Amino acid sequence: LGDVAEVRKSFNRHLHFTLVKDRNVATPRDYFFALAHTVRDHLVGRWIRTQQHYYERDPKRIYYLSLEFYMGRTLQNTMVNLGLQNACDEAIYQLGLDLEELEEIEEDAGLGNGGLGRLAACFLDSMATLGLAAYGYGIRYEFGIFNQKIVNGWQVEEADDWLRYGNPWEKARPEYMLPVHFYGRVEHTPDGVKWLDTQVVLAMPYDTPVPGYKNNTVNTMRLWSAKAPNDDFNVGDYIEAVLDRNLAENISRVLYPNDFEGKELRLKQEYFVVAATLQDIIRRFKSSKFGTCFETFPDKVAIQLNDTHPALSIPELMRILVDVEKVDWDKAWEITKKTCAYTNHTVLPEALERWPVSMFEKLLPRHLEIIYAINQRHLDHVAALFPGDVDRLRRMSVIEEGDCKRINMAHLCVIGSHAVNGVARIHSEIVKQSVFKDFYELEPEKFQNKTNGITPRRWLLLCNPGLADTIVEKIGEEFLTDLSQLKKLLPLVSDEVFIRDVAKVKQENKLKFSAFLEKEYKVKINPSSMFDVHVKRIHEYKRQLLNCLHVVTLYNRIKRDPAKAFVPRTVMIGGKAAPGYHMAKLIIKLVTSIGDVVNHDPVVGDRLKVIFLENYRVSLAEKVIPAADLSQQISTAGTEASGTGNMKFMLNGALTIGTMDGANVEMAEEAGAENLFIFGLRVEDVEALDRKGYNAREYYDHLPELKQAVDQISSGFFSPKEPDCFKDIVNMLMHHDRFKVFADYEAYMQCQAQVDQLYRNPKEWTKKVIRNIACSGKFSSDRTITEYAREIWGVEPSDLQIPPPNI
Amino acid sequence: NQKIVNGWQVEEADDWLRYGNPWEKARPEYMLPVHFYGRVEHTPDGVKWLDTQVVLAMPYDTPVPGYKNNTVNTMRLWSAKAPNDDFNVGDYIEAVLDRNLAENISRVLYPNDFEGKELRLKQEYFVVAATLQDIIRRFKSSKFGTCFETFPDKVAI
Amino acid sequence: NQKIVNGWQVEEADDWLRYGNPWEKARPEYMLPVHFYGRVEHTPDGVKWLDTQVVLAMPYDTPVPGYKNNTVNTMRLWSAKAPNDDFNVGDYIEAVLDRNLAENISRVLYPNDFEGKELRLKQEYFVVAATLQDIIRRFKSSKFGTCFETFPDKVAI
Numbered sequence A: 001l002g003d004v005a006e007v008r009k010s011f012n013r014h015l016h017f018t019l020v021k022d023r024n025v026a027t028p029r030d031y032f033f034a035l036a037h038t039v040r041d042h043l044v045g046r047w048i049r050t051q052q053h054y055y056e057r058d059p060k061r062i063y064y065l066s067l068e069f070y071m072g073r074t075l076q077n078t079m080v081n082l083g084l085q086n087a088c089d090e091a092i093y094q095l096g097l098d099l100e101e102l103e104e105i106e107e108d109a110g111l112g113n114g115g116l117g118r119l120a121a122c123f124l125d126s127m128a129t130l131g132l133a134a135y136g137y138g139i140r141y142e143f144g145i146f147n148q149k150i151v152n153g154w155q156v157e158e159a160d161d162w163l164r165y166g167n168p169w170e171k172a173r174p175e176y177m178l179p180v181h182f183y184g185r186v187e188h189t190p191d192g193v194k195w196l197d198t199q200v201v202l203a204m205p206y207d208t209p210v211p212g213y214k215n216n217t218v219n220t221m222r223l224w225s226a227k228a229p230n231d232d233f234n235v236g237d238y239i240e241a242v243l244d245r246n247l248a249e250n251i252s253r254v255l256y257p258n259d260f261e262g263k264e265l266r267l268k269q270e271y272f273v274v275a276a277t278l279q280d281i282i283r284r285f286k287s288s289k290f291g292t293c294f295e296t297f298p299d300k301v302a303i304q305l306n307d308t309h310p311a312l313s314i315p316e317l318m319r320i321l322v323d324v325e326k327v328d329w330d331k332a333w334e335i336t337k338k339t340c341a342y343t344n345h346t347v348l349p350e351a352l353e354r355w356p357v358s359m360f361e362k363l364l365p366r367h368l369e370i371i372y373a374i375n376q377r378h379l380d381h382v383a384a385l386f387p388g389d390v391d392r393l394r395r396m397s398v399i400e401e402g403d404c405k406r407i408n409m410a411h412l413c414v415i416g417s418h419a420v421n422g423v424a425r426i427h428s429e430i431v432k433q434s435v436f437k438d439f440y441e442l443e444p445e446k447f448q449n450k451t452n453g454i455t456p457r458r459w460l461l462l463c464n465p466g467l468a469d470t471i472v473e474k475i476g477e478e479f480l481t482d483l484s485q486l487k488k489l490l491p492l493v494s495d496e497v498f499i500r501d502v503a504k505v506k507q508e509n510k511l512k513f514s515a516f517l518e519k520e521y522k523v524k525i526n527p528s529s530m531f532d533v534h535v536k537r538i539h540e541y542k543r544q545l546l547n548c549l550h551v552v553t554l555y556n557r558i559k560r561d562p563a564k565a566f567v568p569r570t571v572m573i574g575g576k577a578a579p580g581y582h583m584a585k586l587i588i589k590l591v592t593s594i595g596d597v598v599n600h601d602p603v604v605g606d607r608l609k610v611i612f613l614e615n616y617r618v619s620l621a622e623k624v625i626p627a628a629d630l631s632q633q634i635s636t637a638g639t640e641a642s643g644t645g646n647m648k649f650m651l652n653g654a655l656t657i658g659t660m661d662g663a664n665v666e667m668a669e670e671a672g673a674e675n676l677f678i679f680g681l682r683v684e685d686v687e688a689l690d691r692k693g694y695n696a697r698e699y700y701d702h703l704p705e706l707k708q709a710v711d712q713i714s715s716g717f718f719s720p721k722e723p724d725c726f727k728d729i730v731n732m733l734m735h736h737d738r739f740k741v742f743a744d745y746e747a748y749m750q751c752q753a754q755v756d757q758l759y760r761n762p763k764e765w766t767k768k769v770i771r772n773i774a775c776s777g778k779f780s781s782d783r784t785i786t787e788y789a790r791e792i793w794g795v796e797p798s799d800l801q802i803p804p805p806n807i
Numbered sequence B, C: 001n002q003k004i005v006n007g008w009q010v011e012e013a014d015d016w017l018r019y020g021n022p023w024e025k026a027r028p029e030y031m032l033p034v035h036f037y038g039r040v041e042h043t044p045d046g047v048k049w050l051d052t053q054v055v056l057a058m059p060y061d062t063p064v065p066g067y068k069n070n071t072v073n074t075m076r077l078w079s080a081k082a083p084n085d086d087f088n089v090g091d092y093i094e095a096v097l098d099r100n101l102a103e104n105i106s107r108v109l110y111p112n113d114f115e116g117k118e119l120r121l122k123q124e125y126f127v128v129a130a131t132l133q134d135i136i137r138r139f140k141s142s143k144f145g146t147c148f149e150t151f152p153d154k155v156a157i
């Protein structure tokens, strides 16, 4: 190949001219950078051409606004979307280096946190693959959230210094910087409303390429860094300036800060992305090749609000249009509603974001005025349609009364958007009928569903090339951009060759992940054991404790009859606890405490191993998901909207043990519920238990295997040196357990036995797996994005065709 | 001071010393130092606590009268004050803040502030150190005063 | 930058790095610590300088080309940066100020600020300590390296 020679020549060129190093002084990190630059150069040609193409053809632009972008690592994705993986592997080998070693030096982008952020990243990959003129907008968080470390079995938060050595992917655009205004006061003058005496924070943009899979599109993620404007002063004025500089820069410091007016910092962050972004969208709109003029704005601009975090987009668009662009209020409002769309990710109305009005009086006095005007006009309309309905007016109002007046940002999003969607079929029904019941009665057509999805490139082609090839051999390459083509795998459940091939891939993946496990955690991993994986946020509603009780029950069962034939398990539990969440940190400690007992018991041996997977991130998900046999998706029914981890396990050859909630429902409906290990209380059963009243004591008293497990946890069997360590866990499970852990224990145990009986038969296990994989095509973010594009954005995929670039 | 506004509790500041307290007598002459931070050094002449920040404990005495007897006892309450005074811009701000953090030791009861827990610990030590130095000073300043063997017979804490 | 406004000199800030310097290469990997303040302790294992504040010296290298020869030498210029990271309200403000006072070591040439004289001394030490640690590191990291006896033959300052 001439390709292998080009990468080799480009790597050395970057090493000498970009890094200003030679092979004697270079570190592995320098080698990662040299390669990352080599690979980025292949994107640049397409990136320039793509932006030249959108300027020429002026397509409708999609703006995806999120406070989270859980991007992971970029080197591998970039290499695969450009087809250069094989050429780089060989070039790096010939250079005396190891591609996978270099891949491990890259930092996980500290730009996301959980589901909401990964959803944004999958979306961006799909929008680029579908040829949409899409731009991701967010904050360039300098220190991510935190890297989880486990010290003495407890979680410790370490700072995520991911930009320490620089990010090779991003380009700084200091020339496209915009001012963000805070505080000040508002004056009504004859020339229009003026927002005066404001503090100014500068928004500095950094652009990152978002490549399309096997097309020529390379889109942009534009992330803003907070910087103070520089400069008279007395001693006090000098200290005021240094502090304002620091408070400016900590807007883009960490994701979801705590600090207790660190809530004011969250509001500042929200406005900082909104104002930065909207000024950029408008500037792009009026700077079009060949440009009263704002009437075409809803035809050239869609703004998607990923949760209520970017909710200020509504009154800020109203502000720029009316106070700067001199557009008439009514016209600006009809423009606002048509440009904005809102996606909700939560169930029950109390999770929805609220801000005190007093906080708005101080930080954003002009936006408060606009919000008040939007609300009044909205309630006049409601009063016209439903005369004398006084309680309807209070329910539908964006401003709520209580111990202080508050602004319901969700209500503001509903009123200022043309479309409102939930993230799964039943969640979207709850969004309609319960969360925004009154809004649904007034405008049913506004409310929609956009079932979540995952990208088939990262969550298959990247993390599981072995499985990807085995599917490619049988049904060709077209499924990678049209994942519903995996249904052609259905007849292959009879094929003895395919079954032994899918099983071989899984075991290869299991062996590669065992090697990571033994090296890092120092536990002897059984290769023939079943990989039982539960990876998500440590939270009571997610019920890692339910999984803990199962593990203790199994430990006790091996101890009672050590001669008995037992299905071997490697139980992996991972996830980050919120720093101030006392119960979740107790739970992490329980898992490691259980593991200490289980993994060091000589009677137990190679039958049961328990590991807490430290620092669950995007990059680690890509190692563990392809190696999983069983996926635990065991949240209490009625708590989960969707879930995307569910989808990742289904595509990578794992069977699912779960409740009938969130994504599991649509996964059952796609593959048939018999191919999934559904158990426990149904949404309606949970409600019926609340009518009876949950008495967890009755369960503990009349379930012997559970009583033994809880007593061990309580008495200090898993914590000999500090026997009251889990007192608050036990106290919660018996008296305050809102998530009904005991109520689902029996059903969960019985269900795990059915899992054990299926794993005992390798062929029928893998047959059920093939049925899962073949019916997962629906859960492609391509499908989700095509849905958003046609039913919300009014754009057609592949209507823009970027041609091969010029160097 | 609790206020009820629109049926809810509002916390208003208790400015009870605004106009002065007629009952109490300031004893600035019986002030004692309270030490914080620093480091500890084991020397041949005994253990030494060095490089400490110092907060001053200023005593105010209030009479506690006995019912139909002639006894009037003392309540001795300590106010936190920073010692006064070279400096660069940063050293000046450090001093102003330490002055404020000193004085907020005796600002409010059970403060919240989340290292306002550190402020509770400071408050606890401030009363302990102030008081114990005063108890000892009183003990050795007795009319006609190895010598500490009688301490448990002359002092109950 | 001198500006003449109404016939008088006005001092305008020289924002020369605003858009970046294309000539220089950042070497964050060759950063060295600079120590300030602290105290000194004579121990049996030698003199120790303890409880110091640390400012980081980040090197930036600029090429210095020879005329019609193949030599391109180095100008190595140090930027002051504070080390990053528990804290109460006062400790937080102390940290933000020390961060600012660290970074203003490499802000302007010949600053005025009147303990801006202390800032000049800090600047002087910052270049000295940064540089001498770099000179020594280069000396002992030579291809094939009591050992300091050749130092005056391999080093002129």
Ligand SMILES: *Cc1c(COP(=O)(O)O)cnc(C)c1O
Binding pocket: A113, A114, A115, A118, A535, A536, A537, A616, A617, A618, A619, A621, A642, A643, A644, A645, A646, A648
């Ligand atoms: C896909 C993914 C998630 C989402 O998991 P859910 O529990 O399904 O919300 C979270 N974290 C990481 C690292 C992921 O890759």
